[PDB]
Design a protein around this motif. Sequence first.
Motif, PDB file in Angstrom:
ATOM      1  N   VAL A 123       1.011  -1.145   0.023  1.00  0.00           N
ATOM      2  CA  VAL A 123      -0.068   0.134   0.067  1.00  0.00           C
ATOM      3  C   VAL A 123       0.700   1.348  -0.027  1.00  0.00           C
ATOM      4  O   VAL A 123       0.312   2.222  -0.502  1.00  0.00           O
ATOM      5  CB  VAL A 123      -1.254  -0.010   1.100  1.00  0.00           C
ATOM      6  CG1 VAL A 123      -1.880   1.302   1.432  1.00  0.00           C
ATOM      7  CG2 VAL A 123      -1.840  -1.174   1.208  1.00  0.00           C
ATOM      8  N   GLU A 124       1.994   1.233   0.877  1.00  0.00           N
ATOM      9  CA  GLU A 124       2.982   2.289   0.755  1.00  0.00           C
ATOM     10  C   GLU A 124       3.474   2.536  -1.005  1.00  0.00           C
ATOM     11  O   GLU A 124       3.805   3.713  -1.211  1.00  0.00           O
ATOM     12  CB  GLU A 124       4.254   1.894   1.503  1.00  0.00           C
ATOM     13  CG  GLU A 124       5.458   2.984   1.431  1.00  0.00           C
ATOM     14  CD  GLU A 124       6.586   2.548   2.357  1.00  0.00           C
ATOM     15  OE1 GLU A 124       6.511   1.303   2.743  1.00  0.00           O
ATOM     16  OE2 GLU A 124       7.513   3.239   2.304  1.00  0.00           O
ATOM     17  N   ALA A 125       3.990   1.418  -1.644  1.00  0.00           N
ATOM     18  CA  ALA A 125       4.398   1.746  -3.000  1.00  0.00           C
ATOM     19  C   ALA A 125       3.338   2.240  -3.821  1.00  0.00           C
ATOM     20  O   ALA A 125       3.431   3.296  -4.744  1.00  0.00           O
ATOM     21  CB  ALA A 125       5.034   0.360  -3.547  1.00  0.00           C
ATOM     22  N   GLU A 126       2.139   1.730  -3.734  1.00  0.00           N
ATOM     23  CA  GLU A 126       0.950   2.131  -4.561  1.00  0.00           C
ATOM     24  C   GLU A 126       0.518   3.452  -4.406  1.00  0.00           C
ATOM     25  O   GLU A 126       0.635   4.483  -5.319  1.00  0.00           O
ATOM     26  CB  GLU A 126      -0.559   1.339  -4.315  1.00  0.00           C
ATOM     27  CG  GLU A 126      -0.019  -0.205  -4.677  1.00  0.00           C
ATOM     28  CD  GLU A 126      -0.107  -0.451  -6.269  1.00  0.00           C
ATOM     29  OE1 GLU A 126      -0.836   0.317  -6.988  1.00  0.00           O
ATOM     30  OE2 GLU A 126       0.564  -1.263  -6.769  1.00  0.00           O
ATOM     31  N   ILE A 127       0.547   3.898  -2.918  1.00  0.00           N
ATOM     32  CA  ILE A 127      -0.091   5.475  -2.912  1.00  0.00           C
ATOM     33  C   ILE A 127       1.114   6.159  -2.866  1.00  0.00           C
ATOM     34  O   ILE A 127       0.957   7.372  -3.069  1.00  0.00           O
ATOM     35  CB  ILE A 127      -0.862   5.212  -1.196  1.00  0.00           C
ATOM     36  CG1 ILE A 127      -1.701   6.501  -1.627  1.00  0.00           C
ATOM     37  CG2 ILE A 127       0.085   5.475  -0.038  1.00  0.00           C
ATOM     38  CD1 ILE A 127      -2.859   6.573  -2.289  1.00  0.00           C
ATOM     39  N   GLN A 128       2.424   5.852  -2.893  1.00  0.00           N
ATOM     40  CA  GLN A 128       3.340   6.697  -3.031  1.00  0.00           C
ATOM     41  C   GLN A 128       3.643   6.857  -4.512  1.00  0.00           C
ATOM     42  O   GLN A 128       3.891   8.049  -4.795  1.00  0.00           O
ATOM     43  CB  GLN A 128       4.762   5.950  -2.479  1.00  0.00           C
ATOM     44  CG  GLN A 128       6.040   6.964  -2.450  1.00  0.00           C
ATOM     45  CD  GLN A 128       7.166   6.314  -1.822  1.00  0.00           C
ATOM     46  OE1 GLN A 128       7.044   5.304  -1.263  1.00  0.00           O
ATOM     47  NE2 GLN A 128       8.257   7.166  -1.794  1.00  0.00           N
ATOM     48  N   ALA A 129       3.577   5.911  -5.427  1.00  0.00           N
ATOM     49  CA  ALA A 129       3.590   6.407  -6.865  1.00  0.00           C
ATOM     50  C   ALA A 129       2.374   7.236  -7.485  1.00  0.00           C
ATOM     51  O   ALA A 129       2.574   8.152  -7.982  1.00  0.00           O
ATOM     52  CB  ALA A 129       3.544   5.050  -7.832  1.00  0.00           C
ATOM     53  N   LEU A 130       1.280   7.155  -6.839  1.00  0.00           N
ATOM     54  CA  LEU A 130      -0.063   7.570  -7.020  1.00  0.00           C
ATOM     55  C   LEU A 130       0.071   9.122  -6.471  1.00  0.00           C
ATOM     56  O   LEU A 130      -0.178  10.094  -6.996  1.00  0.00           O
ATOM     57  CB  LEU A 130      -1.197   7.135  -6.555  1.00  0.00           C
ATOM     58  CG  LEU A 130      -2.472   7.637  -6.980  1.00  0.00           C
ATOM     59  CD1 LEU A 130      -2.692   7.893  -8.617  1.00  0.00           C
ATOM     60  CD2 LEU A 130      -3.735   7.211  -6.415  1.00  0.00           C
ATOM     61  N   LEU A 131       0.751   9.182  -5.041  1.00  0.00           N
ATOM     62  CA  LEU A 131       0.804  10.574  -4.630  1.00  0.00           C
ATOM     63  C   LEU A 131       2.075  11.174  -5.228  1.00  0.00           C
ATOM     64  O   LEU A 131       2.057  12.658  -5.205  1.00  0.00           O
ATOM     65  CB  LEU A 131       0.862  10.565  -3.054  1.00  0.00           C
ATOM     66  CG  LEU A 131      -0.575  10.205  -2.507  1.00  0.00           C
ATOM     67  CD1 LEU A 131      -0.728  10.298  -0.883  1.00  0.00           C
ATOM     68  CD2 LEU A 131      -1.410  11.506  -2.930  1.00  0.00           C
TER      69      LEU A 131
END
Lengths: 62, 50
Positions: free
Chosen positions: A11-19
């Motif tokens: 979830v860190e990698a997903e929302i870090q790329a999206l943010l």
Amino acid sequence: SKLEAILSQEVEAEIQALLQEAEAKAEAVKREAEEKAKALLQARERALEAQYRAALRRAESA
Amino acid sequence: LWTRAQDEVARLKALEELASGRFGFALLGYVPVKAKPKVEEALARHKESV
């Protein structure tokens, strides 16, 4: 614990790329703000140029 | 084809009987003591033995 770290890093990698694409959205906002800023300053450059150019024209003819 | 379809449909009907925890999932089963080794070998074949 282990599964906490695995799924939470996912979830860190997903929302870090999206943010960071949302940071690119904010950077496009800053980009268009610089576009409006340069259009503001350059149109004022053209305005003062043309106005006092015509003022030199009028003072010349007078 | 019907064998693979029955396998996938049984997988779907069993996953219907699961317990999900909002991007987590719980599972509860009952298995005999004579098959605990194959069960542990199958459970070792998870993502990180989740």
